[PDB]
């Protein structure tokens, strides 16, 4: 006699390949811009393939600084950790994701996003506000390398808000060989009134590879990303 255990509607929604849409509206130091993204996610392998387009012309900030803002519901949670996956638990109704990202010795981004299903498509709708940035700084001066971002996202339960918090330090290489710290603070809250999973402490090992489409004439970013939950034995 075998028991498979309960699987939530949210969990089951990610069993295969899911189309993804991303829509971002941003304003950094008065520079307004819009980004649209399309691709797909395969949570079985923690795999994301995405292409983003700046639909307003030239992106006024470096693409690498927008990666983390532009769907952690696609994380691969190992079987023994599936009881700690907040992101899928709240689906399809979704979660709000908010961040403040502090660029060391420069400005900050504040972001607000709604992540939920529209039909069979996982949608990430974002508003980004950046202030206190230096004109000739690493961000507005486009002094960051375009390559590869890899860090652990540290997650803790936020029982008071029936959600989670996260923190991590992204380190963007500067073109002179130095490094630009982007200190991330994150909150996720369910949109609906349904039951949620509140996880034990763990992290998401995340790797993003940035590239270009040789046939694309718009300002854009191609992304291959892998995200795996870890930290619990």
Describe the protein in words:
The protein is mainly beta and 233 residues long. The protein has one domain (1-233): Beta Barrel (Green Fluorescent Protein), CATH 2.40.155.10. The chain is 3% helix and 51% strand. The chain is built from two helices and eleven strands, in the order αβββαββββββββ. The chain has helices at 9-12, 86-89, and strands at residues 17-28, 31-42, 47-54, 95-103, 108-118, 121-131, 148-158, 163-173, 179-190, 202-211, 220-230. It has an eleven-stranded mixed barrel with strand order 1-2-3-11-10-7-8-9-4-5-6. Strand 10 (202-211) and strand 11 form a beta hairpin. It is globular.
Highlighted features:
monomer, 233 residues, mainly beta, Green Fluorescent Protein, 2 helices, globular, GFP, photoprotein, luminescence, Green_fluorescent_prot
Outline the biggest β-sheet: 11 strands, mixed, barrel
Give the CATH class: Mainly Beta
Coarse structural class: mainly beta
**If helices are DSSP runs of H or I spanning 4 or more residues, what is the number of helices?**
2
User: What percent of the residues sit in helical stretches (DSSP H or I)?
Assistant: under 10%
> How many beta-strand segments?
11
The CATH fourth-level homologous superfamily: Green fluorescent protein
Query: Roughly how many Å apart are the termini?
Result: 27 Å
Strands ordered across the widest β-sheet: 1-2-3-11-10-7-8-9-4-5-6
Number of discrete domains:
1
């Amino acid at each position: 006699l075998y028991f498979q255990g309960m699987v939530s509607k949210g969990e089951e929604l990610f069993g295969g390949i899911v189309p993804i849409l991303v829509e971002l509206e941003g304003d950094v130091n008065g520079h307004k811009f819009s980004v649209s993204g399309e691709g797909e996610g395969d949570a079985t392998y923690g795999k994301l393939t995405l292409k983003f387009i700046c639909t307003t012309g030239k992106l006024p900030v470096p693409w690498p600084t927008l990666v983390t803002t532009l769907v952690q519901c696609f994380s691969r949670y190992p079987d023994h950790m599936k009881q700690h996956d907040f992101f899928k638990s709240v689906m399809p109704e979704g979660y709000v994701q908010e961040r403040t990202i502090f660029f060391k010795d420069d400005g900050n981004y504040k972001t607000r996003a709604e992540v939920k299903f529209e039909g069979d498509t996982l949608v990430n709708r974002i508003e980004l506000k950046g202030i206190d940035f230096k004109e000739d700084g690493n961000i507005l001066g486009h002094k960051l390398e375009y390559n590869y971002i890899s860090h652990n996202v540290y997650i803790t339960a936020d029982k008071q808000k029936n959600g989670i918090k996260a923190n991590f330090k992204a380190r963007h290489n500067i073109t002179d060989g130095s490094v630009q710290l982007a200190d991330h603070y994150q909150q996720n809250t369910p949109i609906g009134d349904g039951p949620v999973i509140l996880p034990d402490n763990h992290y998401l090992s995340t790797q993003s590879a940035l590239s270009k489409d040789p046939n694309e004439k718009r300002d854009h970013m191609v992304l291959l990303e892998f995200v795996t939950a870890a930290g619990i034995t």
